[PDB]
Amino acid sequence: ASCPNVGAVCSPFETKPCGNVKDCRCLPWGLFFGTCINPTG
Incomplete structure (x- = not known):
């Protein structure tokens, strides 16, 4: 959850x-990218 790029x-x-971090999710918002977010948070 508390990943390097929240x-x-x-x-x-x-x-x-x-990816290979302390639990993180790439929410692919926008057109081509997204943000490292809190999983289901």
């Missing part, structure tokens, strides 16, 4: 979007 822009087209 509310930080990710992109599912990246390499590790909110």
